[PDB]
Design an enzyme around this catalytic site. Structure first.
Site, PDB file in Angstrom:
ATOM      1  N   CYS A 161      38.231 -58.404  -5.913  1.00 39.84           N
ATOM      2  CA  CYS A 161      38.900 -58.936  -7.094  1.00 39.84           C
ATOM      3  C   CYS A 161      38.522 -58.122  -8.323  1.00 39.84           C
ATOM      4  O   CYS A 161      37.349 -58.071  -8.704  1.00 39.84           O
ATOM      5  CB  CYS A 161      38.536 -60.405  -7.289  1.00 39.84           C
ATOM      6  SG  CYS A 161      39.420 -61.241  -8.625  1.00 39.84           S
ATOM      7  N   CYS A 173       1.458   3.560   3.369  1.00 38.95           N
ATOM      8  CA  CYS A 173       1.581   2.718   4.556  1.00 38.95           C
ATOM      9  C   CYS A 173       2.361   1.431   4.319  1.00 38.95           C
ATOM     10  O   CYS A 173       2.724   0.772   5.298  1.00 38.95           O
ATOM     11  CB  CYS A 173       0.203   2.376   5.138  1.00 38.95           C
ATOM     12  SG  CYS A 173      -0.670   1.028   4.335  1.00 38.95           S
ATOM     13  N   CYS A 214       0.828  -1.199   0.000  1.00 42.03           N
ATOM     14  CA  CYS A 214       0.000   0.000   0.000  1.00 42.03           C
ATOM     15  C   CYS A 214       0.863   1.251   0.000  1.00 42.03           C
ATOM     16  O   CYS A 214       1.685   1.420   0.904  1.00 42.03           O
ATOM     17  CB  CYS A 214      -0.906  -0.017   1.228  1.00 42.03           C
ATOM     18  SG  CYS A 214      -1.674   1.553   1.648  1.00 42.03           S
ATOM     19  N   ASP A 224      46.585 -50.291  19.237  1.00 44.29           N
ATOM     20  CA  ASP A 224      47.727 -51.237  19.378  1.00 44.29           C
ATOM     21  C   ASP A 224      47.698 -52.236  18.218  1.00 44.29           C
ATOM     22  O   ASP A 224      48.765 -52.487  17.627  1.00 44.29           O
ATOM     23  CB  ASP A 224      47.713 -51.955  20.730  1.00 44.29           C
ATOM     24  CG  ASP A 224      46.358 -52.523  21.115  1.00 44.29           C
ATOM     25  OD1 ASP A 224      45.380 -52.253  20.392  1.00 44.29           O
ATOM     26  OD2 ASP A 224      46.292 -53.229  22.140  1.00 44.29           O
ATOM     27  N   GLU A 225      46.518 -52.783  17.912  1.00 43.26           N
ATOM     28  CA  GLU A 225      46.386 -53.730  16.774  1.00 43.26           C
ATOM     29  C   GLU A 225      46.625 -52.960  15.470  1.00 43.26           C
ATOM     30  O   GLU A 225      46.315 -51.755  15.429  1.00 43.26           O
ATOM     31  CB  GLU A 225      45.006 -54.388  16.790  1.00 43.26           C
ATOM     32  CG  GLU A 225      44.913 -55.557  17.753  1.00 43.26           C
ATOM     33  CD  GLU A 225      43.961 -55.343  18.917  1.00 43.26           C
ATOM     34  OE1 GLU A 225      44.447 -55.160  20.051  1.00 43.26           O
ATOM     35  OE2 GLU A 225      42.736 -55.360  18.687  1.00 43.26           O
TER      36      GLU A 225
HETATM   37 MG   LIG Z   1      46.101 -55.356  21.565  1.00 44.12          MG
HETATM   38 ZN   LIG Z   2      38.617 -63.370  -8.083  1.00 41.31          ZN
HETATM   39 ZN   LIG Z   3      -2.751   1.141   3.627  1.00 41.44          ZN
END
Ligand SMILES: [Mg+2]
Ligand SMILES: [Zn+2]
Ligand SMILES: [Zn+2]
Ligand SMILES: CCC[C@@H](C)[C@H]1CC[C@H]2[C@@H]3[C@H](O)C[C@@H]4C[C@H](O)CC[C@]4(C)[C@H]3C[C@H](O)[C@]12C
Ligand SMILES: [Zn+2]
Lengths: 150, 765, 151, 67, 109, 183, 146, 43, 228
Positions: free
Chosen positions: E100, E8, E5, E91-92
């Site tokens: 394949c 306003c 408007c 550790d491991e």
């Molecule tokens: Mg171990």
């Molecule tokens: Zn294989």
């Molecule tokens: Zn108005």
């Protein structure tokens, strides 16, 4: 206070994560020796190195050997430290193989070993886990008041 | 030989560590507490009154710790080892000056003691401050002890550094199958509150709180905050972008669907939905209750007619939600190291003392009122006798909290379990690792890997290996070698500098052309906008490098959400770096020779602006060289020495860059279970359990770190002669072969030491 | 970009609807379209030069006009002078080689342009007297000048 | 604490060379390696037994209870 | 519709008022607009779609090593794809998964 | 080269700068227009401005619902709090010299719908107060000073400005490094 | 290795200046990554094969790998020649900064040696950024298994 | 609400069923570290 | 395909993540043999073929106009011209607001009329404009997307990502006797319990065979027999 001898079952480590339990204690004469008769304090299986990929251990052994011979402590720091070529030169100026592998004799049969052996000082550490504090066994005894179970 | 900057650059690290020890977070925080926060709390809860006796008042003028007058360094304290042996608590008395009156209206004073305060080892108050080799020996104290812990009831306890998510910062996080929910936890001095900003449905965005009823539309709150134009909203939260306007304008009509709105109507709509006032003065229950409910919606305080700042705060929150609606990956990560803050021991002790002081004041006031309930002979004389008897509760509670670690407060109704931990004495490195260790924040969420992964942003701020595996992997962290945590400096004095530099006040610009410029932020609150943000940031960084403003105030930019950010709060991890200008380092080698000669104790480097601190956020603007030979003429900084990526426990590994990373982590874990020397007074000590080595040896292959942390003076290990070989078959998988006769000569020989305590107590009989 | 569809001053108001991919590019045109008067360093230097020539042109344009006013943002607490504020405080002098600068008397600064304002602005004198309160109208604000100290 | 009497590997007595090593280092300034070689320490195990030594007893003795 | 408007700036709406007029109402201030003699409309551009492409897969440019398939007697595999992205414990040692390149048999070591 | 001596003038003025969140500037190359206004309002101790702009009935007025809901709406009402900002200085060129006058406060004027609120106050009908609540109560209780417009009587301010600026000639004592300490 | 970095430079400059040809499944941003993530893999494999071929008789890592008692030729290639590319969550290391992985690299970086590619061997010694990338990749499994 | 009612005496990982009925603690048992022995026969 | 997949299969969850339908085709030709049957199993294409949407007002009528361009349909080989779109729009209107009338003039320039309480027409027009280009005009409104895959044998088959199994088995151009899905519960509802047992066994064998775990098939057989 209590004084403790490194019994069979005590745990060690070498600052590279290769922790282990003492498996056997053998007499000095049943130990490989070099030309001077130096006998190792610890023997470690070479099978822990390739799969775990710890070659900082190998460089530490060489640097320690060269530093002991030269009379100076060596620096292994991250991204720096004593170079391997310098240690090799110092080790060859004193009649040792550049790669830290030495021709040792068997202590059980006396004759030369068919493979050269990696020989030198590695800094170890004894860990707080001792088999004395762990060995537990129960036959009978105290039971819970409620369930009457051990 | 000359000074080579390439190799002599690392000498700045020992200079830094000389005056900024590894244990300095604890020390600095506690020092600042006992120097400033005590007086601040006193000034806060100063005057305790009574309804009766209108000519009566009690005032605290001044406070102290372990000092009565200006001489002789009063209050001889029991030495810490004596406390450790006798099961006492290392503490000092608190004194106050009391202002009390009489029916004759007289002003009298005193130096009144109000309890004992546990003193942190090696602070301004501790006796061991600046000891000599002889003094430490006389008091039976090992000079190499770290410090930064308390002795309470004969036990050594330490307050760990606590990880937190930063407060007063907008955090926009998306979600799948739902939408976008963004939050901002605003913690003031006494109330904390999270103003969640969620998306319910239909692509419209609401507002949430625990003190509002249900789903306030954003257009309505923006009208309640003075943005009632209903097009000013559009130019605010969408700019000129068409992709934003259509996705936002769904809810631009929800403020007209109910009815047309003015400010008062919107305030009425909100105020009909607030919860209560906890049954107090319900006569405000009208539109006028929003004059306070909009005040209590964020840490931003509005105390006059205009609501522009909080209005534009919510508009920017709306803009972030709209961007995240447009596409994800505009959100931010809560595991980013720059979104987290660190709180130290002094900061927690401040809260604990405030709570205990308030409870003590309440009970003192009730005691005075009860004494005055008698209708005769109100003799204010000897009222301090009641304070002297009653004050033991504050000391007892302080000890109980700081020795149990269970911090349960009432001012904030915050309850935490496991704040303090008992100091670990298993080796020299175990205690040093207990220091500099950081525990994770809340929302642990162990099932998710978010707060578990290593972060690239923690380079040189948290150790990359120190981590306990097990089940706390990535939750516990450790500091790096060259770090520095910030202190909350200011917010106001530098805002005037901002406005001087060229930014315009937020109360001058229009919502139309708001997003056509770069907007400056102060601690996350919009302050204005500026043209030439690069020039602004360059001038700011120059003013900070020349020392005109604080050395821990960080400024940067962000081209995505076009802005320049300025942070001034406390808890931000920094680290020193060398400034490089025009492809030239600012050290010039001569400075390094001067440092070596004795001058320039690392303070003059900051003073002359050769090196400076950086947090995680300014590192985004930074572009740093690893080694000096990598300096292209487009770099911003150069790091002082690149092995401080690792902490203190990690500094024991030789050649760590030749192993796999899990091996370095395993060594970090189990270097603290190594048995060796512990302290120079390990034989005067009496502990629960000690492990000692008869013949410890220095390592043959050192590291530059073990020299800095004096591990070569208290080492735990022996240099064995090793043959890597297969022998006897008893070494199959991590099993060793030990030489008998090396054991006989004494190798790996240790000693255990336990203690037993008995008490002969007295009975009522 | 595109635009979804006394007489002309009362037509319905439409927002500015530029495409998301274009907004960055046109943003360097919107600034020069809000006036309509009757590699981040080179860009900022060029903006500074353009703003300098613009503000010089505006200074020439407003030689003597009743209804024209300008707003200067100055540093708070400018150098206090010696009592011999009121009076003359340095000069805003055109530099050499097409540059502009402002002198306060001892300190030289950088004078630039502020943000662009898309509304009307009016300057008004006010009196609190109860016998009569007035709101005298003077003129309309032309543009904003931001002054920043420089070494 | 104090220097071990023997060497862990050889058994060669090094307990009587700690004081000589310190005196050689202090008076008649010498390299550490040449000092070790003048002391008859040739094997690297025996050399390390004296090079990698921390004398902790001098630091434990400052805390004697019978002062 | 998204129009505002004048004087306003609130919002313009279409009203089901009296005498069947869809004029441009405001609801905030007294402002009206006669639609008669119409040209108003709202154009919203729409990206349509693209012709999508297949997803055959690119086993080329994938990590390759030199190993032997367990079922060598069936298929002769001298190479395999791999990743070293399984680590049980610190550790491991690490664990390597293969597949394949000849037949496509996944296994780990 | 060319030097514009910018002076400073009288600070004993209550200058205010109005900002309209609705009316734009420069509909074309032409610098827009200044609207006809009347019946200004102010509120000392809260600086609440209020301005009235009369609407037009011959174009787009909707008299029916206008009168049906609100008794009479032919004027636009703009509210707005006048905030104090530091460093602002108004410039007008009198000679080749520039003339700086401070701005006491700046107000941002936004549309004010009193008639709707009156509709609620007529329809719905059928202890220390610290903070912004006290400010709101003061503003809505002690209220409504009354003003008179002066559209074009600018014939009693410039003289003073050109005189209050030609009254002193000063010399500075702060150095270039010194100013860095000052600011 | 320098051969495979020039080709990566060519791909980067093409994707920057123009519109690189887009692979079927992936987008323009993913086509480049999926191309260089094999352009580096091929060189890693060929260098590893060269080093294994040059390996000596009576080399203990080779004997252990051939025996199947411990390790593999992949492990010994990482030890001797090169441990190539560190990938987390499925592909190269995501950014931890604004359009970067670390503040030592230029903004908008996609070259190898900026996203988790190590051309060093454990024998040679990792640089600081390769050290950190390998650390992240190692920590991934530890935080996963628990 | 930390009180231990009848229901709380039967549930959880450490209740009656999963702590004392299907899984117990036994007599004649021990626990210590392990070490290798090649000359020890398997079995 | 990890332990989350094993967990889904074991839990018999009614909703899984990433369900995939494997549809076996009849022909082998990229152009107009695979696309003509992929075009029958896709998502909401109204905004994918609309090419714009208009909101139009007049003296007494309120319009919504969509200009459905035919070139895109001529490229993506789809079976819908005018009345299929109109019927879909009327079904959507029945689903959402109201079905009154749909006008078609030329080049599919569809128009939609609105009338009914104040501003209800404007609100409904706004809702229709926002929610119009989001209704399926062809395919299955239960399937995310389909992609044609190049098989190792050279065949050109497409596999579908969603829950529309029976519809896919019924669509023209696919082999209904060779069509499978990830969801064992879906296989159970349409094909039976023995088919679901086979599906469980195969899915377990795949999930534990792609990880390198070597488990005897009889253990998995017993697991399936017990589960069903
Ligand atoms: Mg171990
Ligand atoms: Zn294989
Ligand atoms: Zn108005
Ligand atoms: C897009 C989301 C739709 C989702 C909620 C709907 C759409 C298709 C539905 C499934 C099918 O009906 C077939 C099965 C019937 C069984 O009785 C229960 C399981 C079963 C898998 C259903 C579950 C659920 O009801 C689904 C997944
Ligand atoms: Zn020896």
């Amino acid at each position: 206070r209590q004084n403790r001898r490194p019994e069979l079952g005590d745990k060690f480590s070498s600052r590279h994560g290769q922790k282990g339990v003492c498996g056997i204690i053998v007499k000095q004469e049943d130990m490989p020796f070099n030309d001077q008769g130096i006998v190792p304090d610890i023997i470690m299986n070479p099978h822990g190195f390739p799969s775990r990929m710890t070659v900082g251990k190998m460089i530490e052994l060489i640097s320690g050997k060269a530093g002991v011979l030269n009379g100076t402590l060596e620096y292994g720091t991250c991204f720096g430290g004593s170079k391997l070529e310098d240690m090799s030169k110092i080790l060859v100026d004193q009649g040792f193989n550049y790669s830290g592998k030495d021709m040792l004799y068997s202590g059980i049969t006396g004759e030369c070993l068919q493979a050269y052996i990696f020989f030198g000082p590695i800094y170890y550490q004894k860990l707080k886990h001792m088999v004395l504090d762990k060995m537990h066994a129960r036959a009978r005894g105290p039971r819970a008041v409620l369930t009457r179970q051990p | 030989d000359e000074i080579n900057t390439a190799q002599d650059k690392w000498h700045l690290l020992p200079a830094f560590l000389k005056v900024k020890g590894l244990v300095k977070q604890h020390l600095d925080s506690f020092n600042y507490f006992v120097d400033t926060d005590l007086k601040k709390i006193i000034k806060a809860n100063q005057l305790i009154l009574s309804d009766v006796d209108p000519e009566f008042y009690l005032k605290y003028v001044d406070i102290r710790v372990g000092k009565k007058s200006s001489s002789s360094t009063k209050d001889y304290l029991t030495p810490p080892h004596e406390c450790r042996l006798r099961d006492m608590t290392y503490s000092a008395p608190i004194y106050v000056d009391i202002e009390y009156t009489r029916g004759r209206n007289i002003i009298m004073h005193k130096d009144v003691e109000i309890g004992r305060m546990p003193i942190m080892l090696r602070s301004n108050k501790c006796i061991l401050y600046d000891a000599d080799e002889s003094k430490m020996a006389k008091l039976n104290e090992c000079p190499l002890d770290p410090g930064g812990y308390f002795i309470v009831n004969g036990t050594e306890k330490v307050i760990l550094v606590q990880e937190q998510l930063s407060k007063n910062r907008i955090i926009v996080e998306a979600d799948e199958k739902k939408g976008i929910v963004q939050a901002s936890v605003t913690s003031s001095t006494h109330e904390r509150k999270s103003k969640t900003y969620v998306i319910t449905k239909n692509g419209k965005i609401y507002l949430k709180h625990n003190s509002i009823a249900e789903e306030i539309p954003i257009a309505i709150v923006l009208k309640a905050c003075g943005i009632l134009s209903d097009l000013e909203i559009m130019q605010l939260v969408c700019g000129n972008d068409s992709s934003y306007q259509d996705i936002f304008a769904v809810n631009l009509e929800e403020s007209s669907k109910l009815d047309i709105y003015t400010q008062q109507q919107a305030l009425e709509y909100i105020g009909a939905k607030v919860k209560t006032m906890r049954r107090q003065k319900l006569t405000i229950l009208q539109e006028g209750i929003e004059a306070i409910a909009t005040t209590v919606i964020a840490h931003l305080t509005v105390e006059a007619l205009d609501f522009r700042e909080k209005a534009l705060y919510i508009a920017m929150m709306t803009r972030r939600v709209v961007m995240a609606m447009y596409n994800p990956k505009m959100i931010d990560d809560r595991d980013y190291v720059g979104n987290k803050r660190l709180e130290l021991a002094g900061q927690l002790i401040s809260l604990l003392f405030e709570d205990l002081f308030k409870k003590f004041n309440n009970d003192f006031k009730l005691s005075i009122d009860k004494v005055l309930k008698k209708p005769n002979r109100a003799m204010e004389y000897d009222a301090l006798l009641s304070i002297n008897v009653h004050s033991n509760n504050i000391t007892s509670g302080l000890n109980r909290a700081i020795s149990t670690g269970n911090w349960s407060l009432k001012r904030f109704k915050m309850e935490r379990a496991g704040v303090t931990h008992v100091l670990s004495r298993l080796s020299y490195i175990s205690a040093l690792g207990m220091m500099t260790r950081i525990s994770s924040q809340f929302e642990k969420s162990r099932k998710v890997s978010g707060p578990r992964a290593l972060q690239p942003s923690q380079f040189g701020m948290l150790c990359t290996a120190d981590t306990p595996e097990g089940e706390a992997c990535g939750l516990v962290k450790n500091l790096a070698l060259m770090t520095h945590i910030t202190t909350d400096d200011e917010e106001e004095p530098i805002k005037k500098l901002c406005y001087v530099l060229g930014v315009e006040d937020i109360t001058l610009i229009d919502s139309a052309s708001l997003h056509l410029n770069y907007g400056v932020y102060l601690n996350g609150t919009l302050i204005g906008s500026i043209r030439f943000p690069t020039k602004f940031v360059t001038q700011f960084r120059h003013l900070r490098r020349t020392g005109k403003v604080s050395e821990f105030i960080s400024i940067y930019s962000n081209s995505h959400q076009m802005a320049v950010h300025i942070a001034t709060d406390g808890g931000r991890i920094c680290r020193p770096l060398i400034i490089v200008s025009d492809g030239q380092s600012r050290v010039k080698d001569i400075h390094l020779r001067k440092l070596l000669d004795g001058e320039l104790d690392f303070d003059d480097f900051l003073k002359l602006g050769l090196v400076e601190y950086l947090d995680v956020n300014e590192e985004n603007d930074s572009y740093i060289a690893l080694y000096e030979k990598d300096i292209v003429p487009s770099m911003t900084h150069l790091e002082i020495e690149p092995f401080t990526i690792l902490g203190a426990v990690a500094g024991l590994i030789p050649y760590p860059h030749h192993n796999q990373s899990p091996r370095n982590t395993y060594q970090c874990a189990m270097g603290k279970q190594a048995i060796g020397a512990i302290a120079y007074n390990q034989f005067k000590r009496i502990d629960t359990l000690l492990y000692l080595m008869t013949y410890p040896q220095q390592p043959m292959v050192k590291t530059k770190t073990i020299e800095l942390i004096d591990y070569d003076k208290l080492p735990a290990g022996q240099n064995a002669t090793v043959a890597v070989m297969s022998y006897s078959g008893y070494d199959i998988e991590d099993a060793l072969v030990l030489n008998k006769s090396s054991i006989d000569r004494g190798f790996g020989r240790c000693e255990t030491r336990r203690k037993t305590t008995t008490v002969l107590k007295r009975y009522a009989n | 970009x595109x635009x979804x569809x006394r007489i002309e001053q009362l037509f319905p108001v439409r927002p500015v609807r530029v495409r998301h991919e274009d907004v960055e590019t046109v943003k360097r045109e919107i600034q020069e379209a809000l006036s309509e008067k009757p590699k981040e360093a080179a860009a900022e230097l060029e903006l500074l030069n353009a703003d300098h020539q613009h503000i010089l042109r505006k200074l020439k344009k407003m030689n003597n006009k009743p209804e024209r006013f300008m707003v200067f943002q100055l540093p708070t607490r400018l150098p206090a002078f010696e009592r011999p504020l009121a009076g003359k405080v340095g000069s805003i002098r055109v530099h050499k080689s097409g540059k502009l600068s402002v002198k306060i008397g001892n300190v030289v600064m950088d004078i630039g342009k502020g943000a662009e304002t898309t509304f009307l602005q009016d300057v008004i004198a006010l009196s609190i007297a109860d016998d009569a309160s007035s709101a005298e109208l003077l003129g309309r604000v032309d543009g904003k000048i931001v002054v920043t100290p420089q070494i | 604490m104090i220097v071990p009497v023997r060497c862990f590997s050889c058994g060669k007595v090094v307990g009587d060379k700690w004081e000589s090593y310190l005196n050689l280092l202090q008076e008649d300034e010498l390299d550490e390696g040449t000092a070790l070689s003048r002391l008859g320490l040739k094997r690297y195990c025996c050399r390390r037994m004296i090079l990698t030594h921390v004398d902790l007893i001098e630091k434990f003795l400052r805390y004697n209870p019978l002062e | 519709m998204l129009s505002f408007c004048p004087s306003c700036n609130n919002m313009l709406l279409i009203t089901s008022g009296d005498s069947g007029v869809y004029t441009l109402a405001c609801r905030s201030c007294p402002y009206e607009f006669p639609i008669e003699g119409i040209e108003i409309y709202d154009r919203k551009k729409l990206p349509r779609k693209e012709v999508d492409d297949v997803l055959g897969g690119g086993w080329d440019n994938v990590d390759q090593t030199k190993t032997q398939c367990p079922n060598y007697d069936t298929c002769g595999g001298e190479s395999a794809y791999f990743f070293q992205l399984q680590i049980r414990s610190a550790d491991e040692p690490m664990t390597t998964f293969y597949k394949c390149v000849n037949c496509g048999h996944r296994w780990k070591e | 080269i060319e030097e514009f001596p910018l002076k400073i003038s009288g600070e004993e003025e209550s200058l205010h700068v109005f900002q309209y969140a609705n009316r734009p500037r420069l509909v074309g190359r032409k610098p827009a227009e200044h609207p006809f206004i009347s019946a200004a309002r102010y509120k000392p101790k809260s600086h609440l401005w209020e301005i009235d702009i009369p609407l037009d009935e011959q174009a787009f007025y909707n008299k029916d619902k206008a009168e049906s809901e609100w008794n009479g709406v032919n004027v636009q009402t703009l509210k707005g709090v006048g905030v104090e900002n530091n460093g602002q200085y108004a410039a007008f060129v009198k000679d080749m010299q520039v003339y700086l006058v401070p701005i006491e406060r700046v107000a941002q004027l936004k549309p004010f719908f009193k008639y709707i609120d009156d509709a609620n106050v007529t329809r719905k009908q059928e202890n220390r107060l610290t903070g912004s609540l006290l400010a709101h109560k003061v503003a809505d209780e002690e209220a409504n000073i009354e003003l008179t417009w002066a559209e074009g009587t600018f014939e009693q301010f410039k003289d003073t400005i050109v005189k209050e600026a030609e009254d002193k000639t000063l010399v500075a004592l702060e150095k270039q490094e010194d100013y860095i300490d000052n600011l | 290795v320098e051969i495979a970095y020039h080709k990566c430079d060519e791909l980067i400059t093409l994707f920057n200046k123009g519109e690189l040809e887009t692979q079927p499944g992936c987008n323009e941003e993913q086509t480049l990554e999926a191309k260089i993530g094999g352009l580096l893999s091929k060189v890693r494999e060929e260098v590893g094969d060269v080093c294994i071929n040059e390996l000596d008789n009576w080399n203990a890592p080779l004997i252990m790998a051939t025996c199947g008692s411990k390790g593999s030729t992949l492990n010994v290639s990482q030890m001797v020649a090169v441990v190539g590319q560190q990938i987390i969550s499925g592909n190269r290391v995501p950014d931890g900064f604004q359009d970067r992985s670390l503040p030592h690299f230029p903004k908008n970086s996609k070259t190898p040696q900026s996203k988790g590619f190590v051309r060093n061997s454990f024998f040679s010694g990792l640089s600081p950024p390769e050290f950190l990338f390998h650390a992240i990749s190692g920590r991934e499994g530890l935080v996963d298994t628990a | 609400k930390p009180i231990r009612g009848f229901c709380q005496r039967l549930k959880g990982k450490q209740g009656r069923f999963r702590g004392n009925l299907s899984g117990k603690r036994v007599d004649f048992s021990g626990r210590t570290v392990i070490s290798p022995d090649p000359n020890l026969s398997i079995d | 395909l990890g332990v989350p997949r094993i967990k889904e299969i074991i839990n018999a969850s009614k909703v899984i993540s990433t369900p995939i339908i494997n549809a076996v085709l009849v022909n082998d030709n990229d152009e107009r043999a695979a696309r003509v049957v992929k075009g029958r199993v896709e998502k909401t294409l109204l905004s994918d073929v609309a090419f714009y949407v208009q909101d139009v007002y007049k003296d007494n009528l309120s319009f919504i106009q969509v200009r459905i361009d035919l070139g895109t349909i001529d490229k993506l080989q789809l079976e819908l011209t005018i009345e299929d779109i109109a019927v879909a729009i009327t079904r959507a209107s029945k689903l959402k607001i109201q079905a009154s009338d749909v006008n078609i003039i030329g080049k599919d320039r569809i128009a939609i009329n609105v009338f009914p309480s104040e501003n209800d027409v404007f609100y409904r027009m706004q809702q229709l404009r926002r929610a119009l280009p989001d209704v399926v005009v062809k395919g299955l409104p239960d399937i995310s997307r389909a992609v044609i895959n190049i098989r190792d044998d050279g065949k050109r088959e497409l596999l579908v990502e969603g829950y529309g199994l029976r519809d896919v088995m019924c669509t023209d151009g696919v082999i209904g006797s060779r069509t499978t899905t990830n969801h064992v519960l879906e296989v159970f509802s349409v094909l039976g319990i023995e088919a679901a047992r086979y599906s469980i066994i195969r899915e377990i064998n795949y999930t534990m065979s792609n990880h390198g775990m070597s488990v005897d098939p009889r253990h998995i057989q017993l697991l399936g027999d017990v589960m069903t």
